[PDB]
Design a protein around this ligand. Structure first.
Ligand code: CU
Ligand code: CU
Length: 444
């Protein structure tokens, strides 16, 4: 048995009447010979890549065929509260939901997943995640690698814990609420250590850390560089060459990597400093996927310049908001907090100004856990990350910011409304923390 081929999510576009159908359902997937019940969008596991065009409205019809309630959140999309599919956007079992997305942001890889209050971790663990590929008039002029599933590939990396029966083993209990749900089976687009057939020249990887709790650190088996071309919210001004790429839960980077000879190399994840994430088999470099070159040459290029990043404005005069994350020293369902309160679906913590720059200061000072802090409804600028100026590859458009025993500062603006009944969320994207209170709503 050769390694399995990397599964490629289907590139899903609008039909005749500008509609997209998404069915949330249960099926079966096989993992190392053993069948398991899994959940998928438009299939058994994970989901398709929804492809939107900047400025072209589309309607998404969502059918919930699960045995519990769900929501469908578009992680990274600047859309109104009413289509954002946070915990208020309940779709009951057997239920249907329609949403109009009017995409009004630069080209980027976003994603979608459940946001059910207290169940998100379980619902992502069982298999639900999809991709969103935004294109605009600018990115297509660049001549990047762009053959979907050939030289432009999504890489959804996820660990799972299985019971001896072969079934996914999720439980949100008093330890998971603290440290997060993780396992020793690493999945790459839902496959174990797949291989991807790549043409000579530039391979474009759209990396997503789709793990509940585990952070990742991408490198190559032979330490060839990754050229970072994009972050969560789209293109950097120019490529940032790195030898390793840390990626928090819920973050996307797009990287070019060279396929310059006929020899296979792996994309790996390196050991991380995170409570209990460096236990074997993550105590050494762990293979993510085998890149197998084909003698085909690909025309994609690494442009010396990608885009223009607008100047930071003056920070004098801007509203400051302080967000203190805290974990109850020892009811575990409400142990994690922001500003001393566990998520109340009913009571938004504050109202942001529409179209007005704000500085949000997020503080994990008082514990040493990793909190990838995610704000809905915006692509922001990181001003300070964990008490340093941001790394070059992290200094563009971001929807997540590291908070780990220190203080981060991001420049935020909300171009779209979110009323009380469909508030935006701001939360830790360690899903078990989210599910145990580490989240607020806010209005616009
Ligand atoms: Cu989000
Ligand atoms: Cu957290």
């Amino acid at each position: 048995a050769e390694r399995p081929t990397l599964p490629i999510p289907d590139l899903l576009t609008t039909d005749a009447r500008n509609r997209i159908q998404l069915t949330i359902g249960a099926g079966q997937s096989t993992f190392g010979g053993k069948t398991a019940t899994t959940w998928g969008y438009n299939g058994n596991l994970l989901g398709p890549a929804v492809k939107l065009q900047r400025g072209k409205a589309v309607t998404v019809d969502i059918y919930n065929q699960l045995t519990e309630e769900t929501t469908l959140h578009w992680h990274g999309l600047e859309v109104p509260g009413e289509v954002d599919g946070g915990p208020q956007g309940i779709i009951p079992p057997g239920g249907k939901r329609s949403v109009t997305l009017n995409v009004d942001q630069p080209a980027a890889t976003c994603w979608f997943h459940p946001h059910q209050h207290g169940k998100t971790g379980r619902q992502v663990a069982m298999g639900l995640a999809g991709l969103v590929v935004i294109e605009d008039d600018e990115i297509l002029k660049l001549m990047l690698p762009k053959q979907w599933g050939i030289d432009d590939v999504p890489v959804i990396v996820q660990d799972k814990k299985f019971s001896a029966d072969g079934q996914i083993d999720y439980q949100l209990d008093v330890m998971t609420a603290a440290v997060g749900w993780f396992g020793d089976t690493l999945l790459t687009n839902g496959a174990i250590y797949p291989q991807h057939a790549a043409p000579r020249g530039w391979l474009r990887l759209r990396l997503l850390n789709g793990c509940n709790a585990r952070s990742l650190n991408f490198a190559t088996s032979d330490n060839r560089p990754l050229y970072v071309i994009a972050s969560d919210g789209g293109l950097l001004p120019e490529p940032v060459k790195v030898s390793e790429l840390p990626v928090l839960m819920g973050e996307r980077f797009e990287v070019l990597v060279e396929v310059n000879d006929n020899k296979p190399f792996d994309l790996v994840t390196l050991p991380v400093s995170q409570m209990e994430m460096a236990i074997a088999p993550f105590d050494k470099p762990h293979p993510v996927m085998r890149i197998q070159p084909i003698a085909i040459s690909a025309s994609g290029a690494l442009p010396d310049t990608l885009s223009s990043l607008p100047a930071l404005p003056s920070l004098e005069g801007l509203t400051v908001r302080k967000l203190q994350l805290s974990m109850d020293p020892m009811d575990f369902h409400h142990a994690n907090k922001i500003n001393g309160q566990a998520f109340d679906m009913n009571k938004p913590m504050f109202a942001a100004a529409k179209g007005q720059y704000e500085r949000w200061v997020i503080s994990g000072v008082g514990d040493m856990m990793l909190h990838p802090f995610h704000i809905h409804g915006t692509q922001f600028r990181i001003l300070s990350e964990n008490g340093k100026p941001p790394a070059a590859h992290r200094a563009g458009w971001k929807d997540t910011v590291k908070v780990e025993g220190n203080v981060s500062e991001v420049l935020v603006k909300f171009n779209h409304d979110a009323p009380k009944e469909h508030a935006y969320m701001a939360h830790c994207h360690l899903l078990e923390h989210e599910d145990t209170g580490m989240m607020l709503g806010f209005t616009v």
